[PDB]
Every structure is written in C-alpha cells, then in structure tokens.
Design a protein around this ligand. Sequence first.
Ligand SMILES: [Zn+2]
Lengths: 550, 318, 145, 244
Amino acid sequence: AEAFLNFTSMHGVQPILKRIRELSQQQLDGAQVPHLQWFRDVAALESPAGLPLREFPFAVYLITGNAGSGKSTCVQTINEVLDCVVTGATRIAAQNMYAKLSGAFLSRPINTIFHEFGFRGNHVQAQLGQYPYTLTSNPASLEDLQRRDLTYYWEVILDLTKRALAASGGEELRNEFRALAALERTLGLAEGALTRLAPATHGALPAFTRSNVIVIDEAGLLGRHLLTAVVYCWWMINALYHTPQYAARLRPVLVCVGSPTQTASLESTFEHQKLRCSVRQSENVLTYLICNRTLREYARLSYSWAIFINNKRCVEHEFGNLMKVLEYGLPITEEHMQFVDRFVVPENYITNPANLPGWTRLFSSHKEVSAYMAKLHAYLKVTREGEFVVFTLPVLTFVSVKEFDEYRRLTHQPGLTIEKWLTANASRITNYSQSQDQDAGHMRCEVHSKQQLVVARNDVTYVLNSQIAVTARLRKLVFGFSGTFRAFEAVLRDDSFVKTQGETSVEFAYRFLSRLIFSGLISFYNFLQRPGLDATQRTLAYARMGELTA
Amino acid sequence: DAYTHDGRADGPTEQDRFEESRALYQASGGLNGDSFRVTFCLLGTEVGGTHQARGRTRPMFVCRFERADDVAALQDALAHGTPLQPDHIAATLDAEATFALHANMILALTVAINNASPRTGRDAAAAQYDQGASLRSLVGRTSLGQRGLTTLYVHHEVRVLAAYRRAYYGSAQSPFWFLSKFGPDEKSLVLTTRYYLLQAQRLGGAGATYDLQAIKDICATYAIPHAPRPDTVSAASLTSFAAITRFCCTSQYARGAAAAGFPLYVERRIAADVRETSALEKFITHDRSCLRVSDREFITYIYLAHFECFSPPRLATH
Amino acid sequence: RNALEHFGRRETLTEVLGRYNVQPDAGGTVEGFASELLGRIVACIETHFPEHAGEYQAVSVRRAVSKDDWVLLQLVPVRGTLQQSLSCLRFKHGRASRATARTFVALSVGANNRLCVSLCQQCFAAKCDSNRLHTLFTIDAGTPC
Amino acid sequence: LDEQQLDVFYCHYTPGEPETTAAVHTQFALLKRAFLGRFRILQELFGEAFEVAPFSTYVDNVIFRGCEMLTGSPRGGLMSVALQTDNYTLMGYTYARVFAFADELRRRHATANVAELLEEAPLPYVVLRDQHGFMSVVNTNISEFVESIDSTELAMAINADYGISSKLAMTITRSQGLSLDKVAICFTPGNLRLNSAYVAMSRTTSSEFLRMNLNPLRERHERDDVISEHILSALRDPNVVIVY
DNA sequence: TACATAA
Ligand SMILES: [Zn+2]
C-alpha cells in the first residue's frame, strides 16, 4: 500500500525539526557579529597574508544516509514547516529537488549554491591555491581553519568582495532596507514591521537576505573550502543591506544532506610550463565536519546528526548483506567472494557491442569509452538492425590570435603548435565532461584572416532515434507533433503543460496549441484509407462528421 | 471553517468541543447565527511573526454580514456554492478592518516609489526645505487607506501588481492543482483541505507541524462509512472553480458530525502513534548505548531490532 | 530465521549436485561431472581466448578442495601436452618468468537452485600476485534438470 | 472518393486571428471542443485502430529527407528551457534559420567575430522529441574559455558544439550521481579501489542485471576505512538520531 | 583514472 511506508519516516522527523528550530533562533552577542569593516579591509588587500584572525559564527545540521533511503522526505518536511533556502551542489540535483518539492505541495525555483552566493562565469577558471599557508596553532582553532579556507579560495573570494562592494554605487550605502528602518524609527512602529516587507517590494534581492537556514543537497560533491566561503558570503550579503536578521544577531544554519560514503570531490591543477592537467582527491564538506576534531567540538555534531538507515530500493538478501558489508567496512569473508563470482564475464564479451544489447558500460577512462563508442557506431553502421541510421555533424572552435600571442608572451613557450595546445587543453575548452567520450574524426585546422582567427573543425558521430540527454541550458522551441491521438488528447485535457512553462508565456502558448489544433486536421482520410477497413462505415462517418459540423 | 469566540477560561473537554462545533454546522449546510464576520483569505505566508510552523494562508479582506439579505446570500454561498457577486462584498466590506492589513504594504510601496534619490537640498531662495522635512511631509501626506491604495493602483498598476503577487506567493492556482494536491477522494478533498489550510494553524495542536502527506495519511484511517452522492465531478470541467466549489460545498463531509470531529481524531491518532514510537525508540537507544559487541554483530542487531519493531505486519496491525 | 521466513529456503550444493546424479563425496562422481562439463569450458575459452587453444586439448580433472558449498577441482593436462604449466590468460608475462598458472573449476550453487561453474587461475608471477585465486569467467551450467 | 472527401468543415469554418486573453481563451476552448468532439466520434466509430494510428501535426510544412528536416520558416512555437533531467530522443538535424537563437547568440557574446563567423557558415540545429512527443529545435551549445594567468585574464577560445550526451557508456566517477538499470562494469587491474567497486555496483536496484570483467573482492584493492569507522562510532552515540 | 560550478 502507501500508508505504512511513511509511518516510520513521519514520526521520526519531528526531533529534527525541533532541533533545527532551536538552532536557527539562537542569538549571538554584540561583539561577535562580523562588521562591514571586516569585508572593507578584506577588499582593500593584495595578497592573503594580511588577513587577521577573525571568526565567522555558524551552525550546521547533518542529515546523512544512503541513496534512496528517504532524506528527500525530510527535506520536504523542512521546506513545508520551516522558512529555509533549498539549494543544490549541481544543476541535476537542484532540478530533482525542485521536482520533488513542487510535486509535494509548492516550491520556488531552486538554484545551485554557487549561483546563490554569487559565483560568476569568470570565477570558473581561477587558479585555486597558489599562496602557501601553514597552520600555526596545535590543535587548530576555528579562526585558523577559516583563514586557511579563505587563503585557498583567495581569487574567487577577493573578486566576490570587490564586486559586491563596488556594485553599491560608491559610498552611497544600499537603501533597500535602511529607508524602511528609518521610517520605522520616525513613525514609532514595531521592529521589523516594515523592513521585512522589503523582499516583497524589491525582486532583485538575493535569497541570503531572506532566511538564515540554508539547505544544501548532495553536500558530498563539494570542496571543503566551500564550507567557509558560503558562510563568509552570507555575512557579507547580510552586512551590506543591514538585513533584519543581521540586526537581530542571527547565525547561518547549514543543513547538509548527502551520503559520505559513495560520493567524493576532486581538485584539478594545470601546469602551463608542461601543458599538463593533474587531478587528485580532496575532502568534501561531510568528511570535513565528521572527521575534524575542531569542527566536531565547535558545531556539537553529536547533537546535530541524523542518520537514515534502511533502503527502499534493495530487495535482495545476499545483495543487501554485501552492500551493508561494503558500506560499513565490515570484514570480508569467503562467502562474499563466492557470491560475487556469479557476475564475472570475460572482458571481450563486455567490450563487444553485439553482446548485452542496450546495457550501460562503466569504464575507468575516457579513452576506453571513446573506443567502445567508436566500435558500437561501426557495428551499427554495418550490422544494422534498422530504425537507427548513423550520421555525422560538424563542430568547431575559434581561437583568437592576439590572445594567443599574449598567452605565449606571458608563458615563455617560444613555439606552440595549435594542434598540440588544443590536444593538451581538450579537457578545459568544453563546458561538460562528456566531450571526451564523443566519437570524433580527423581534426582539421585553418587560419581565417580579416577576423584574425583560427578555426579548428571536426566531426561528431551520432545515432538516429536514440535516447540522449542535454547537458546545458540550451533554450529550445517546440513546433508541433504529438505521436498518437491518445497522447494528443492527454496533453489537451491536462493544463499541466501550460503550468510547466513560466507564468509569462501562457497567452501565446495557448495560441500555439490553438494553431496546432487547427493544423492537426486533414489526413484523417489516409487513416480511413487503411487497407480493408469498410465501405458503409465510411459513409456513416461522413454523415456523423457532417452532422457535428452543422 | 466556523468558530465562536471563547470567554470561559476553563479548558473544554474533548466531548464538549465536539458538541459545540457540531451545533454550528446544522443539517442544512448553512451555519447557525444571526450575524457573521468573515475573513476572505488567500494562499501566502505571513511575515513578521514567529510560530512553531510558518503560516500557510494569509487573509486578504474582512466582511460583516448582519442584514437579512446579506445573511441569506452568505448562507446560500456557504451551503450550495453559488458565487458571491462583487456588489455584496462591496456593500458589506468592513473598511477599517481590511485596511488595517494594507497599511504597512502601502507605506513600503510609497517608499519604493520615492527611492530615486532624496536630495532635498535645492536651496535656492524659498526651496531650501530641510533634509528630513520633505520625507516627513511626504509620509504624512499619504492616506493609509482606500485613497492611497487606489492612487497607487492608478499610477503604478504594474509594480503594485508585481509587489502584491510576491507577498501572496502561490495565490494563483488552477482547480486542477487543488484537485491533485488535496484530492483525489471527496473526503480527503474536503477534510484535508479545511484542516491543513485553515484549522491547523488556528487550533495549533500537535498536528500543526505535519506536512500535507502526513495529514492525508492520518485522514485515510478516519473511516466514516459513506453516503453515496447522486453524481460526481469529471474532467473538462476543471477550467473554472464553480464545479469544484459546488462539489465541495454540498458534500456530506462539510457539515454535521463528520466535519465536527476530524481535528480531534487527528490529535488522538498523533498521540496514539507517538506513545508507542517514543517507548520503542527509548528501548532501542538504551540497548544501543552499552552493547559491548563487535561491529558486524552490532550492525546485525541494529537492523534486526529496527525490523522487529516496525515490520510491515506490525505496522498494519497498529 | 527472519531471512528464511522472508526470502525462502535456499538449496545446498549437495541436493543440486544430486539433481545431476553427482555426489560431492566418493571423489569419482565429481570428476566425472567435471569431465562432462569440460566441453562447455573449452568452447567458451575458444570463443573468448583464441590464442590459448591447444593447451586444453587433453586435460584431466583432480579434486583440490571439497566443502559444503564450494568445490574446487584442478585441471591437469594429462601430463602429455608438452607445456607442463598452463599460461596466464589475463596478461602476457616475461619469457624467463614463466607463467606457471594452475587452472581450477569451481562448482557452487549461486542463483535460485541453479548451478554455477567458474574458471579460476593461480599465477605465480610477480604481476598477478601468487597465493591468490582469480576468477576469469562464470558460465551457467543448469540445463539438464 | 465521395463528395465530402476533404472534411468540408474546413470550408465552413474560418479560424480568425486571436485577441485579448478572454478572446484567446474562447477561441482555444471552441477549437478544443470541436477537436474533442471529432476525436470522440471517430473513436466510437472504429476503436483501437484509430487510437494507435500515427499522428503528425506541424505548424509549417515539414519534410523528413533521410536524416535531415526541411522546413521553410520556423515561425510559431513557444520558447522553453531544456532540462538535464528530462529524457529526449534524437530525431535529426535541420538547417532552418531561427532568428531568436541567432539574436541571442549575438547578444550574449561580446565577441562578434565568432558571431558572424557562425552566421556565414551556420551549424545545423538539432531536433528532439520529448517523452510526451513534442518536436523541438534546440540551440547549439556555445562555450567561452577565458584563461586567467597570475593577474591577467584573456578571453582565449570559443567552442561550438551541440551539448548532447548518450547514456550508453560512461566513466565510473561520472556515474556516481546517476541511477541505472543494466550495468556492465569494466574494471582495470592495478589501480582498483574498493570504493570505486562499491559505487559501481551500487547503481543497480537488483543484481539480475549486473556484470563485470573481474571479481573486485578477490583482487588487490585499496581500502581506506576512516569514514566508516566514524559512522559506526556515531551509531553507538545516544545523542545521534536514527531514522529507519 | 577522474567532476562540477558559468547561463
Ligand atoms: Zn599471470
């Protein structure tokens, strides 16, 4: 049924709600709230060596558990009961969380945390970590860890502070909240009766000025230095505008949801003098909180931890036991080794596209994926089962000669072949990591003059009638077709299609379905021209249609 | 929902509130009484307050029905489902009660209008008004009632609409959304809607901190048998609210003892579940505390105990 | 007890083997069953490892490990295939460091009352490990029920 | 054929241009009512044969020549944003020029050289069909690459692709944020870790559709139990909430 | 070996 599947997951979340409510209402002292002078002094620096030892207060709540174990219901209840800001580490996670929340009761659009604290396009290509930092105090204090995390993230943090303090129009302090407070003081009204209406009147205010409870889903896919930056950004965003929560001395509460075991983060670096990319493993936020002694004592993680056990997906006994053994690091016996022997299959069996049709193959490298995709495309071309025809499309990159000249002047490198540089930097020009798994042909280079550009053209091979995913925004336009009459009537009866679009396109969307309905006629006789249907029934249909038209 | 103001300080028993509330919804759909004070309300969260759970509904205006014609129209609207014409609401509108709500918002909108730049330093010969005198005069010259609101609507309709559509977030929803969220059954569509949207915050019991799905699951076991209505609603009619309003207002679950005893059962069921859950959790935690046993056997114990306490057969029996 | 009452009883290796008229004890029955099953093993190794073809032309089966749920037999090449030690089927090792890989057939229950036969190898090379047993592939054998 | 061979309702009905929201709603409602009535009549007439018959309605004249889609002008159709969580089916490529996409590419990018170099030799747009069955042209994936060296930022490269990925083969690390149905893992001996194996075999809800080239438990693997110990020690803490 | 953020 559906009633007993939520019994244990609806009476066990109330303590979580009570603890988050108690955490989110604690008031600091007047001497611990970061002042605007802190960020003004930070923005007036050149190297992260003049950073003083200051602490940014915060609190955390951990909600950890395996994938599919039911933390989404906890987040749903938190959103429905509390006044929180729900975010996501990636766009896929944000979209999934928005789908769940909007399917439960109601939700605002959900954005990533990077968009929440102001991560712009340029900050993507910053050199994360160049100034050495050595811990001084043993054991380390909170201020030392915060300073280390700020030094690691120096470029992005400095750019964020500079942009935030420069977008204020000079020395003129932002008047989104100050005018309302002044009117409150003059008119003799209750505190917060007028300032809290500022988000209603102004629609450009950031979400960090609206609530102090920030829910981060899939917190394991994040660097540990993002545990401080967020908090830092929060204080900055609440120091500029003099938000009512800042005047009430409230601290940010970060509710992290994710699985610490089957999820990790990576750090990449580029050596220009060698044209090399090196990727290593680092600590995520969950491991940073769970393992570090200082953060464990500061955040009181014993009283702020909720572990979700039991899996709604696993339905096998031996597989479940093996999964439990793997997750908790239990000793591996010989019975497990004998059990896993069922799935062993020769490598040539897997790599051959003929065997196991329609299965997803996981490799440990991009070259293997590319080779398998090329083999699959070649096999589909010759041994065609039909309904899928393999075609190719052009793709191209433009390089500016002046920028390359500046780059070579800065980075020595007396000679630099276009092909060699593009091959070495093939993992950074693109905006998605699946570009290295695409079947590509011979790479061609040419020099286009009067534009002072270099064009690198290639071909990418695709399979017709295949299920694929779009890994970008990629605004699209719909222009008709519905497959079958049943689907057309299903989409006509339901108005959810209009609601899926934004609340600005309804009128001409309705216009578009109206013209689709108009153009959907004719060719009904072709259906009536199906082989051997009837003779008199056609005349009966004629009469019925004429009567309906009349 | 209908309620009467309480003057008796002694806490009524469960059997007293049920009889008091059942006497309101008589067996005609229309509430008893000679005068009514109705608060017309919309979806949206209230700001500036602090409660256990954030508000789900925000009042929009207030009307008073005391005359015979107005009372008859209100009873017809509440019983059968005939919509209220704007003439009746305009005539019965309670001006100061509704415009005490739209007093801070008008001030905020006026401040946002005039926030271009407060130079107030023109000097000249007679235009040397003080740095704070211009703002004081402008604030004091704004009527925080009907005149200010209508002037703002006439001059700045687009921005006023955009601002009012943000404080009342979610107030514009289609009937299909209401049918899909709070539905699909008639009993759910009536009782769950009325409790979750209106009575949960007002009563403020132990059920004020439960989500929509939990309230629906609780209502699932509220098994008042039936009374088969002649006809039901169908598709292609959810374009307008008239069909769903007529369906809900003439329902068996919107009046009588069926609607007079749902919050009491919600509290009873919540308490009954918590009584067992807390004890079982305490047992499991105490056995967890010491348990000087190896890791593999500890995991075995944890999963075995959690399965034995809340196995699906035991949940079904409970 | 909960697992038995929830997921059902699982057959032991003895009953499944007896379903093929083969007893784990007495030695000879297991070796005869392996002799019958060898055809599928050589067919699979020919299909997927074509370079190692003549090594398995004439092989003999000898019991190595007998247990309640797992039976391991050794595949000796009837002492008449010139190459005394079979080569490793995973990697190409050095010329001097001959891959003296011993090959085994492992019988277990596995799936729902079916039978699982697997090929295993022990290679004393420095690249693989030695002392360690590597499973190469597993083929279903349950058909003559 | 008979005299009424072309659904003479066309000659008797003129769908004039719409008007304000109320008029749009009325015209849409009447057209929908007529279409629903015709659908009901022809469904009652035939049944399942009519229900599963192929249906194809397009705003303009659309021709499918092999793998290419040919249309005169892509005028008419709502704009939307393609979601990475939605499932699309590849249908082909078209060379039809969309004014909105070109204008957006001009506006968003300050580099006009890329803009008119793409204008002179335009890439084909990709047509995809959603789960419901709505054909849509998707804009090309255009990416900027600005390199930051020391304290110097240079807008160096501009890439132009289609930004579509096939769910047939992927890396193990990429699969840690996905859920799959049938999985055939291909480990590499020498650098095998138990965490990678756990992530790989954790992607399938059942073991009936799992395959691998080697036994990850019988080989040499790297074990780093620093988090599992902390989690197990947390399960013995009376202050830690546990939800079943 | 190896992924995300930008919009
Ligand atoms: Zn070997």
